[PDB]
Symmetry: C3
Subunit: 200 residues, 3 copies
Amino acid sequence: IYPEFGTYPGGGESPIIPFGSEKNAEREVIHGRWAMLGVTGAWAAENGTGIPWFTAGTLCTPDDCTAVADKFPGAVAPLAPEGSGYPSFWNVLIIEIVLVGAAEAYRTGISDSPFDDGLTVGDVNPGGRFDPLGLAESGDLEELKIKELKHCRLSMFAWLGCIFQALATQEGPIANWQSHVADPVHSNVLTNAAKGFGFY
Amino acid sequence: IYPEFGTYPGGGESPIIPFGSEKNAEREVIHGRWAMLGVTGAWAAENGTGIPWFTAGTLCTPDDCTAVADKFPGAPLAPSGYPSFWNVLIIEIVLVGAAEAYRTGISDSPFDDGLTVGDVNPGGRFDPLGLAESGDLEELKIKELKHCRLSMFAWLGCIFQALATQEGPIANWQSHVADPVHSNVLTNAAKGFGFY
Amino acid sequence: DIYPEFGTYPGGGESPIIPFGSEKNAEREVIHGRWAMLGVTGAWAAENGTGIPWFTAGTLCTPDDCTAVADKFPGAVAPLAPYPSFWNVLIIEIVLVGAAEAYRTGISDSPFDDGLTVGDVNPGGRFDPLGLAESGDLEELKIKELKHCRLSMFAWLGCIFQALATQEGPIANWQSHVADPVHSNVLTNAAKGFGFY
Ligand SMILES: CC1=C[C@H](O)CC(C)(C)[C@H]1/C=C/C(C)=C/C=C/C(C)=C/C=C/C=C(C)/C=C/C=C(\C)CCC1=C(C)C[C@H](O)CC1(C)C
């Protein structure tokens, strides 16, 4: 259901853009799960540490990646020994791209499917293996599907936000949010347009 | 008649961007009217006041929109710092929200005048002179969409130019007329847009 | 395996991303890319011959005059200028290119009328002077040109993008990258902030 605006892929069509390829539905949902994780990560990283997500791109560089050690709120220990440099960027990126590429190739059937029970390639939400808690079978899986997709679109809008705010304010989404909640009259996009977004 | 590149929706129907729905034709002509009003409003704003159109909002302020009071040439817009930005905004939100709800039909009908909800240029009521019936309607809609498209392209130019020159549309007009060959787009790029 | 790269060619198979139903854009991709390949190729050739970036090569010429190119070419036995004037080369450029466009798209009559249909992107009847069209099979050679066409369009997009980020020039960016690839790339230039941040 979409009383707010638009509709879901199963029924109806967007007047703003024709449906086109089907696989856009699959593409949209995965994009949204990713933006959910990205926005939440931006939110929580800048909540605990304070640094914006976009600046946090340089959180690890081939010369400087041991900086990340113990950069987590309340973390029991640092990620790696402090000042060792053993948490090199080369290592952490290699491990990352290995685990991601394996997950994505198993997702899309590039390589194989290690699990032998269904798990059809090309589905948003199989739920054989990727539902350990049984909340889909518990009920309202379809309601949860609409809920999922709406959270997807909201989070992609939020991520497009966080990108835009970075491009204009250069301050970070939570810092912008705190500034807006403190004095909403004089902390908005248009007063930043009046200052000229820095570039003007 | 539309003897120009492309084709009006419902005619020959040969678009660059695929014709997804009629509703895009509706959005084009409605964007076109608002861009018509935007272009002529900017033109009159800065030939009268002398400021860039985009800074007009900057000249108004939430605390003092009396900064824009009586900016109109040849005319007391308001007597005290009475005109507030929220004041004009709440009058505004009511009027434009009514008019839009009335146009699309989310609210009830204003009147039982034979009007068709959701259709452009229905005419009759919205034509006090009756030009729609006095002239043949078809070529008149062609002119409607043609001027709509021209003003939209003008508005796209004005926004991108406010981004480029940072001086406003008359300033581009004046820079271009006083020196056509130099002080143009490619000289502005040559000397830099202020960033390079 | 002809075109195992991502996607499919316009003649056969629907795209993987953007659906389409018009053959006009299928024509247009290959001409846009051909124009790109000439642009990108000239990017190296010019930037290597003169040692300046292509985007400042545009403004090297002024409306008042265009003499900067005189003896700017590498190995020129005689400079092209002896009227090194922009408008003198402009009218001849716009007339020659305009005529070419009219002749290739059908605005004006073809000067040869050798059967080259303007609608056809491959009027080999007068084109491919070497005659490689008939020396080898045409289909594979269509694919090869197309692949390069897409390659060079993406390279032009990336070229212009790097132009806007670093303003140092595509091949100067290349030299900086190969000099120290670890600490010279898009992400370290974004760490500097592309100059604007
Ligand atoms: C966690 C975190 C912390 C670190 O510190 C830094 C870090 C970078 C690592 C970071 C990690 C980041 C990650 C993983 C991000 C993932 C992002 C993703 C996948 C975003 C998706 C973005 C999606 C967009 C734009 C879509 C736009 C589409 C739009 C508007 C149109 C929608 C639309 C449709 C089709 C039909 C309607 O009817 C009408 C309209 C036209 C409106």
